[PDB]
């Protein structure tokens, strides 16, 4: 115990798990993720790397959150019409966009 083993940021003892030295200082796993994690425009919560972080057009999305508003199909790396707050299939989008 010569050195200190606490998240230099939350100062909470690292919880039963490995840790990252951030700012030359131990940070709890969560810190590293929450700090640089991306926000899921669908959930609004940071997307940790411990999950499928879908990245499309400098934006981020849970591979499960990215879907069509009508077919609820999971559009990923697939063509989609980006609506103001929704995503649709170029088939459904062209159905209303018309
Ligand atoms: Zn922390
Ligand atoms: Zn999400
Ligand atoms: Zn659709």
Curated annotation (Swiss-Prot):
Residues annotated as domain LIM zinc-binding: 40-92
Part of the whole protein covered: 1 to 98 of 279
Quaternary structure and partners: Interacts with ZNF638 and TTN/titin. Interacts with E4F1. Interacts with GRB7. Interacts with SIRT1 and FOXO1. Interacts with CEFIP. Interacts with calcineurin. Interacts with FOXK1.
Tissue: Expressed in skeletal muscle and heart.
Location of this chain's protein in the cell: Cytoplasm; Nucleus; Cytoplasm, Myofibril, Sarcomere, Z line
Domain note: The third LIM zinc-binding mediates interaction with E4F1.
Cross-link (Glycyl lysine isopeptide (Lys-Gly) (interchain with G-Cter in SUMO2)): 78
Zinc finger boundaries on the chain: C4-type: 7-31
Protein name: Four and a half LIM domains protein 2
Free-text function comment from the UniProt entry: May function as a molecular transmitter linking various signaling pathways to transcriptional regulation. Negatively regulates the transcriptional repressor E4F1 and may function in cell growth. Inhibits the transcriptional activity of FOXO1 and its apoptotic function by enhancing the interaction of FOXO1 with SIRT1 and FOXO1 deacetylation. Negatively regulates the calcineurin/NFAT signaling pathway in cardiomyocytes.
Taxonomy, superkingdom: Eukaryota
Organism, scientific name: Homo sapiens
Record's signal peptide: none
């Amino acid at each position: 115990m010569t050195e200190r083993f606490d998240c230099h940021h939350c100062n909470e003892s690292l919880f039963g798990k490995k840790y990252i030295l951030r700012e030359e200082s131990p940070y709890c796993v969560v810190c590293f993720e929450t700090l640089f994690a991306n926000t899921c425009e669908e959930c609004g919560k940071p997307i940790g790397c411990d999950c499928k972080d879908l990245s499309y057009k400098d934006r981020h999305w849970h591979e499960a959150c990215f879907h069509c508003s009508q077919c609820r199909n999971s559009l990923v790396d697939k063509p989609f019409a980006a609506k103001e707050d929704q995503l649709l299939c170029t088939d459904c989008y062209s159905n209303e966009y018309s």
